[PDB]
Design a protein around this ligand. Structure first.
Ligand code: HEM
Lengths: 498, 498, 498, 498
C-alpha cells in the first residue's frame, strides 16, 4: 500500500469489484463497438467522416480546457460544515449564526496567487482561503486570504499589482524589476510585504495557516442596529511553515505538496478545523480609529478589539471529481445574506463587481447553475431567464416581469440593506499618503523576534538583489521609513550581493 | 376566455391560486428587499456598485441571447411518444423497433429554413421536421424535412445555397439575383424547386404536412444483414396548405401562426399524429437503380418500393419553457443506435460532421448535458471529461483512460458498424451532370393536375421576375429541359411582368 | 435597371471589369482545386476526413451567427460626419465642439426595440438612433432614441419592461396581458405610451424622424463650470409617418423597408441630415424645476429651455459589409470625452454598466478592436492586455503596470471629472409616485389636435382589447388620471370590441 | 547590466529616450484624469457605477485569460526565415521549394507536452517543434516533435494517452499507475518510451534538439507524380542534454530555462539554425517495406532511405508581445500547399481534424485573422463570412455564393489533390499487434552504448517504482519482449526499490 491519494484508482476498482463494467458510449448514449481502432477503407486506407465515435471523443477532448483563474489559478478544495458554537445574534441576524450547534455545509478552496495551473504549491506567496456557506438565505462567500491585510488600498491598483507579479509581456519571465518598481513606488505595500517575506510566507500545507476576511464588513441585527466587523479563522492544527530550503526542494520534488497533504489528511480521518472569530467596532469607534478603519493595509489591534468566538469550520470530505467540484468553484464576495453587508473599503467595493464579472467569462453566464455553485439550500426564484447552457426548467412558465398580477415571486422588505449616511464631493480622493509605516514598525519590532527579523531581511535581499540599483535604493528608503535598522539590514545584504 | 395560448399566465396563476408567492432572490439565493428601486446616495444621487441586486439581474439580462440556428432559426416544439405498430425486426435490430406496442419518448421541432428568429411562419420555404427518440441505446435523431428531396446533392454546395437564400452581404436584403443565379447555375435543384413553388410550399401549420428523412439510410438486423431505407412520416390530420393570399395576410397578422396552432391543438387534446413508414432497397436493387440511389435530388418510386408501416409519432405535451426545451434543442444526424447507419449519400456524410460542430458553437461543448439533449434513457459512460459548464459529477473518480486495469467502461462488439466494400480512386467525382430533369417531368405531368401546374408557374414567375433578364433566360432554359410547356408557361408570365 | 440596393452584385461585378477573379482559397490561404465536389473513395463512396476544404468551409459556416442584440436587434447603419456650426464652448470644452466648421466622422445605427433580427421595419415601436463620434479624445457614443422620454425611470424595471414587450416564456408568442399588466401597474409609462400610440409611433423610415439623447447629461467648460443639458437632433427631411394600414401592408410586403430606404437615399446622393441642438439648465435651475430634472419620463419645456444650435449630422456612406460594419457596431453611453459627463438620471447610471457588459458577451472581450468600434482618431495607450481574439500588437513590450519608472502612459489631470456635492442615506428611494400625469395632460390637450387624439385612442384600444378585462380597467383608470375624456374615449372603443 | 531578457523594460525605456509618454486612455480612447484613486462620495464613501475608468479596466483584467493548449501548454516562440539550398522540385512542385535561395518567413513554437502553463521547462517529456511557413500558396504548418516517432499509432488512443500522462481526475496529482497501466497495456509505446527515458528525454533548451515531421507525408511534382516522404530538421548547434540531476535543479531554480535561453541567444545575435532534410520512398517501396510505412511507431532506416538536403531554418527575431504572438499561435497540420499532401497514417488523419477544431474553441471561430495566424503572403478569397470577432472587411460586398455569374473567386484545377487508389471494407482494423519490438531492439542494442543503456534502465526504474507490482510486472514483460536484458536490468533496479 501507498498513501490514499496514490491508491485512488485501486480503491475505485475495489469499491466496484462486482460492478460489471458499464458499456462505453458516445456522448449521445450510443454504445461503441471498438474505441481502439479508427474506421478506414482497408487496413492502410484513409479515415472516414462516418467515424462519429472518433470525432465525438476528439471534439470533446479538444474543448476540455477553460480559462484558468486570472489570479489564484493553482489550488486545492475540500467540503465540510460550519458549526455555530457561540451567540453573535446581538451583532448579526444572519440565519447562518441563528442558534448554537446549527450546521451549514461549506466548500473551501486554498490557493497561491501568481502561479499558473502548473506551478508549485511550496512557493513564497499569499494563500487564498475561500469559504462558501450554503445558507437558507442563499450562499455567503467569505473570500479570504492567509493574511488580515493586502498590498494596496484601492482596486484601481489591483490589475497593475497583479501584472507586476506575473510575467514580462515580451519575455514571459518573472521580472524582479516589475515586482520592486511597483512595490517601491507604492509603499502602502510595506505591511503585507513584511508579512509575505516572514516565515508565514511559505505555510506547511493549507491546514497549518490562518484565514482572514481581511476587509471590514458590516453586521446588522434583528433591530436594524449595525456594527463593523473583521472575520478571523485560526487553525486548530497550529501555525507551521516550511524553511526556504525545504520549500525549494518540494517545489521540484512535489509541486502538488498542498493538494496531496489535504487529500491524505481527510482520507485518513485527520479532518482539519479552524475556529471562526469576529472583531466588532462600533460606528462611534470607527470615527475615533487613528487610521481609516476601511484601509485594507491596516489591522484592528486585538488589545482594543478582542476576538469573539463564533464557531467551527471542519473539512471532512474530499472532492470526487476535481474539475467539476474545485476547478469550477466560484466565490463572489457580493454573495451576502441578510445580516452581513459590505463596508466602504475601496478594495471590497471593487470585489463586489470583479468576481461575478470574471465568473461570467471563465465559467459562463449560467455559472451559478453549476452544482458546486448552486445555492442548493435556498429556493432561487426571480425574473432572470435564458442565457447559454441554461440547465434546469429555466423557472418554467412563471411570469417573467415584475411587477405582475399573476402571483410570481415578491421582494421581502426585511432583506432591505442597512441605512448609512454619507456626505461629500464625488471625487477621486488620494489614499496613497495615509500612514504606510506605523503598524509595520510594531510588527517588525514587537511581533517578530531577532531571528525572525534576520530571516525577513535575508528573504527580501535574496529577491530584491535582482532589481536595478535605482529600484534597490527606493525600496530600502521605504524599509528605512518603517525603521532605520530594517533598511540598513537589507542594504548590507544587498551590498554583498551587488 | 380566449385561446389556451392567450391564457398561459391566467392558468399559471390559477394553478398557483394558494401558492403563497416565492421570495424573489438574486442568482445566489439571497432574498431581495426592493427590486423596483436602485441603491443611490439620496433620492437624486448616483448609483452605487454596492447595488449587487441591480448588477446580478442586469448582467444576466445582458447575456440572455445565444446565437440563433445558422438555418431553421424560426421554430415550434412539442413532446410525445413513438409507438411501434408493426414488425420491421427483419430489417433493423434497433431497440426502438424491438416489439409491437413499445413506446419511446420523442421531442419534435418544426421550422422554416431561411428566416431569422423574428420572421413569419406562413412564408414559402421547406419545413424542418426533426424528431429525437430517447432510446435505451441512446438518442436517435431523425432530422427530417417536409420533402423527401433537397436542392443539391453535395455538402460543399450547402453554405453557398444557404448564403444565396439569406441576405445580400452589403444591403442585408433578400436578393432574387442571388436566389436564381445559384438555382439557374445548379439545375440539380429543379426537382425540389418544383416541390417548393407548388401548393405544399406553404403548409397550413406543422400538423398538416408530412415528414421525410430525405436521405437513404442503412438498416442492419440481428444476423448482420443490411438493407438501404427511406423514412416517411405521413400526417394523420391530412395535407392542408395556405393560399399565397392567406399566407401573405397571416405573415403580418400572426407571424407565429404555426407556434399558436400547435400549442392550442395540444392544449385542447387535439394531439397531432403521423404514421412512420420505411421503403426498403436491397444492396442488389441499389446496383440496378437507374439513378444514384444515394442522390438526395431523387425519390424511390412507391410502385417499385412500397411504404412498409412501422408505428405512430404522437405529440401530446407542450413545452413549459420555450427557451430551455425548444430553443436549446440539438438534433445530430450522427446520433444513431445499433441497427441504423448512414448510407454513402454525400449530403448525409456532410451532416454527420456539421450538426455536432455547430451545436458546440451555438450551445456549448457540453450541449449534450442540457436536459432536453440528454440521452436520459441510456447510461452515458466513457472517457470524456471536463469542458465549460460541466454539469453532473463529470463521471466522478472513474479511471479516465482506455484501456485500463481498473474496471472502467468497456466497448461492446455487437455495436460494431456493418461491413460494406468500396473500391476506387480517392477523387472529387463530378455529380453535377447526373439526371436533373427525369423525376421532375413525372412530377410536373403525372403528380400535379392542370390548376396545380398553373399555380406552380405563377408562383415561380411571381418571384423570378425580380432577377436580371440573363438569369431569367438561364432559369427558363432549365424548366424547358424538364418540359417545353413548363418553360413556356413561366416565360409568358415573365414576359408580361418585364 | 432597378433600385441601387437591388443592383448591388451587378455594380460590384462591373467595378472590377478588368476581371482576373481571385483564386479561391481555404482560410489558411491554400488554393482550392474543386470546391463543388467532395473527396470520396469512388463516385458512390464515403466522405474522407482528408477533405480539409469541406471541413474548413463547413466549420466556418457552422460558426457564422453571433447573439443578436438583447434589444434593438433589427437595424440599419450608415456613416458620415458631424460638422460644428455654432460656438457652445461656453458650455463644453469637448474637442468635438472646439471651433466652427470642425468635422468629426460618425457611425449611425437605426433600429426597432422588441423585434428579433427577422421582424418587420414598419411596426409600432420606439426607434433607436445611435451616433458614434470618432473624436481625438476617443469615441463619444450618443445612444439616442426617436423620443425625448422613456416608459420607466429606474434601470431595475428595464429587464422586466423588455420581458413584458417580448415573447411569453412558455408560448413564445407576443402577449397583450404581459404588455398591459406591466404598463397598467407602472403608470410612469403613460407619457411615452402616449408618444408611442400617437402618429410618430410608425415613422416613414429612419430619415423622417428626430433623434434625442433623452437623458439629462452634464457639460463642463475650460473653467470647470458645469451645466445640465439635453441633446436634440431634428430631421432636415421633415417628420413623416406611415398610417397603421400602410405600415401593416409594408410589414409583409417589405419587412426591410427601412434598410432599403436608407441605402437607396445615400446611393442616389440624397444624403439625410439632422441639426444638433442642446437645451441648457443651470444647477440652480435644476433645484427649482417643478419635477425631477433627471426623470427620464419628463421633458424640459422649450418655452423655459429653448433649443441652442450646435451643428449638423450628415450620412453620406452606405456600409460595404453589413455584418462587419453594422451587426458588429457597439455603442457605450459610458464612452464620453472630457467636456461631457453623466447626470444622476437613475436610467443613465444603469446604462453606464449595461452596454460594455452586453458587448463583452455579444461580441467579445476585445470588441473595441473590431475596426468599426476602434477609436481610430485617438491613440489608445493603457495597462490593459490580452483576452480572446487580441488583434493588434497588444501594445508590444510596453511596461504593463502603473505606476512605473519606465516611461509607459501617464494620466492627464485636465481629464478629471467635474466635482459635484451629494448628501443622503444609502437607500432604495421610491420614484414610482413622482408626477405620472401632468406633462402627459399637456401632450394630450395642447400638442395633439382632435383627429390625433382620436387616432391615439383608436391605436391603444386596438391593442388593449386583447388584454383581460381587469387589465383593461386598470389601464383605463391611468388614462383617466391624465384626463377623464382620454380614459372614456378608450373605454368606449374597448366597450364595442368586448 | 544583466542578461538581455532581464533588461527588457530598461531597453524599452531607453529606445523612446525622446519620451513624451503617451496619454493614458480607456479602451474607448477617452483620456484618464487619475487611474490611481476610485470615484467615491467623500473620502470614506462608497464606489460609484459612474467610475467607468475602473469598470473599463477591471472588466478587461477579468477577461485576460484564454484556455491553455489541451497539450503542449508550456512553450517558447521565435520568428525567422526558411532558405532553400537544394533542388527537390523532382519530388515537390510546392512554391516553398521552387528555386535555390528562395526565402519564406517562418514562425516557430517549442513546448513540453503534459505540463500546464506554470510547469517547468527542464522535465522529461517529448518536445514540440512547430514551424509555420507563410508561403504564396498560403500557410504550410509542419507541426513536428523532437522525435521521429510517437507512443501510439491510432488517434482514438490519443485522448486516453494524454489523460494517462496528466492529473488523476479526483486527486489532481500525477499518477504513475495511470502512466504505466496505459503504457504496459499498449506495448506499441515501447519505441518512443525508449526514446523518452534515454538522454534526449531532457534536451539542454530548444536550440540543442532536432525536429521531425514524424509522419509519412506525400510530395507531388509538376507531372502529378507522387512519392512518400519524412521531414527531418537537424540542429546546427548540436545535440546537448541535461543530466536528470541538473534538469531537477533548474526545475525549481529557473522553471523558464528554455524561454530564457532562446530569447538571450536571439537577443545577442547567436541565431539558432536547423538543416531541413527529406527521406523519399516510392509507392512500390511502400508495398515492400517490412512494416507499415504509415505506422507512427516506426522509422525509415537511413541506410535504406538516406537524408536529402532541402534548406535552412533560421530564428533571428524574438516576440515583442508573448500573448499576441506566441500564446495565440495556431498550427494546423491540414494547412498544406499544393505539392504537399497527407499519407494514410491513422495518427495524421486524426490531426487533420483535431487542430482547426481545438483552435475554434481555444482562440475563436476567426482565429486565422489573428495577425500571427494570417496567411499574410497569400490573398485569402472565398465564400466564408461573419462569425464572432470578424476583423477585416469580411471581403466587403463580394458575391458570397459559389458558383456565381458576378466575378467572385474561382477554384484552380492545378491545386487538385493527387489521385491514389484504395480497395477494402469500411471497418475498424486492429493495429495493436503490428511489430512493437523489432526497431526498439536495434535502438537498445545498436544506437545506444552500455552507459546509455544503464541510464535508460535507471530512468525507467526510477519512475516505474511508484506503480503497483502487477503494473511493474506487465511493463517488465514488454521490455523483456524487446530484449531479455532490457527487462532484467529494469527488474533488478525495481527489486531494490521495492
Ligand atoms: C492523433 C494524434 C494527435 C492529436 C489528436 C493531437 C492533438 C493536438 C491538440 C488538440 C493540440 C493543441 C493545439 C492547440 O491548442 O493549438 C496539439 C498540440 C500539439 N501537437 Fe498534437 N496531436 C496528436 C499527435 C501529435 C504528433 C504526432 C505530434 C508531432 C509529431 C504533435 C505535435 C503537437 C505540437 C507540437 C503541438 C503544439 C503546437 C504549438 O506549439 O502551438 N501532436 N495536438
Amino acid at each position: 500500500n501507498r498513501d490514499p491519494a496514490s491508491d485512488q484508482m485501486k480503491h475505485w476498482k475495489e469499491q466496484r469489484a462486482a460492478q460489471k463494467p458499464d458499456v462505453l458510449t458516445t456522448g449521445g448514449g450510443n454504445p461503441v463497438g471498438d474505441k481502439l481502432n479508427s474506421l478506414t477503407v482497408g487496413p492502410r486506407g484513409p479515415l472516414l467522416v462516418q467515424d462519429v465515435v472518433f470525432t465525438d471523443e476528439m471534439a470533446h477532448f479538444d474543448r476540455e480546457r477553460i480559462p484558468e483563474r486570472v489570479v489564484h489559478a493553482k489550488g486545492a478544495g475540500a467540503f465540510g460544515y460550519f458549526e455555530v458554537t457561540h451567540d453573535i445574534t446581538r451583532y448579526s441576524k444572519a440565519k447562518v449564526f441563528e442558534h448554537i450547534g446549527k450546521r451549514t455545509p461549506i466548500a473551501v478552496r486554498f490557493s497561491t496567487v501568481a502561479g499558473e495551473s502548473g506551478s508549485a504549491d511550496t512557493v513564497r506567496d499569499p494563500r487564498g482561503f475561500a469559504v462558501k456557506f450554503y445558507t437558507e438565505d442563499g450562499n455567503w462567500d467569505l473570500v479570504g486570504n492567509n493574511t488580515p491585510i493586502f498590498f494596496i488600498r484601492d482596486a484601481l491598483l489591483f490589475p497593475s499589482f497583479i501584472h507586476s507579479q506575473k510575467r514580462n509581456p515580451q519575455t514571459h519571465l518573472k521580472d524582479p524589476d516589475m515586482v520592486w518598481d511597483f512595490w517601491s513606488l507604492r509603499p502602502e505595500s510595506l505591511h503585507q510585504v513584511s508579512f509575505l517575506f516572514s516565515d508565514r510566507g511559505i505555510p506547511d500545507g493549507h491546514r497549518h495557516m490562518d484565514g482572514y476576511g481581511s476587509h471590514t464588513f458590516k453586521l446588522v441585527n434583528a433591530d436594524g442596529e449595525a456594527v463593523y466587523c473583521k472575520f478571523h479563522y485560526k487553525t486548530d492544527q497550529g501555525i507551521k511553515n516550511l524553511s526556504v530550503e525545504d520549500a525549494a526542494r518540494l517545489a521540484h520534488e512535489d509541486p502538488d505538496y498542498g493538494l496531496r497533504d489535504l487529500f491524505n489528511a481527510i482520507a485518513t480521518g485527520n479532518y482539519p478545523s479552524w475556529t471562526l472569530y469576529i472583531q466588532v467596532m462600533t460606528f462611534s469607534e470607527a470615527e475615533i480609529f487613528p487610521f481609516n478603519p476601511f484601509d485594507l493595509t491596516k489591522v484592528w489591534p486585538h488589545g482594543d478589539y478582542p476576538l469573539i468566538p463564533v464557531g467551527k469550520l471542519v473539512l471532512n470530505r474530499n472532492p470526487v471529481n476535481y474539475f467539476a467540484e474545485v476547478e469550477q468553484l466560484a466565490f463572489d464576495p457580493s454573495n451576502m445574506p441578510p445580516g452581513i453587508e459590505p463596508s466602504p473599503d475601496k478594495m471590497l467595493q471593487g470585489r463586489l463587481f470583479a468576481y461575478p464579472d470574471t465568473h461570467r467569462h471563465r465559467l459562463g453566464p449560467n455559472y451559478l447553475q453549476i452544482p458546486v455553485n448552486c445555492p442548493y439550500r435556498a429556493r432561487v426564484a426571480n425574473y432572470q431567464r435564458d442565457g447559454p447552457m441554461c440547465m434546469m426548467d429555466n423557472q418554467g412558465g412563471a411570469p417573467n416581469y415584475y411587477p405582475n398580477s399573476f402571483s410570481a415571486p415578491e421582494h421581502q422588505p426585511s432583506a432591505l440593506e442597512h441605512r448609512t449616511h454619507f456626505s461629500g464631493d464625488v471625487q477621486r480622493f488620494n489614499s496613497a499618503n495615509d500612514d504606510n509605516v506605523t503598524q509595520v514598525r510594531t510588527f517588525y519590532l514587537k511581533v517578530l523576534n531577532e531571528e525572525q527579523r534576520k530571516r525577513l531581511c535575508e528573504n527580501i535581499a535574496g529577491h530584491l538583489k535582482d532589481a536595478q540599483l535605482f529600484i534597490q535604493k527606493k525600496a530600502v528608503k521605504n524599509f528605512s521609513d518603517v525603521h532605520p535598522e530594517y533598511g540598513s539590514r537589507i542594504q548590507a545584504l544587498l551590498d554583498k550581493y551587488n
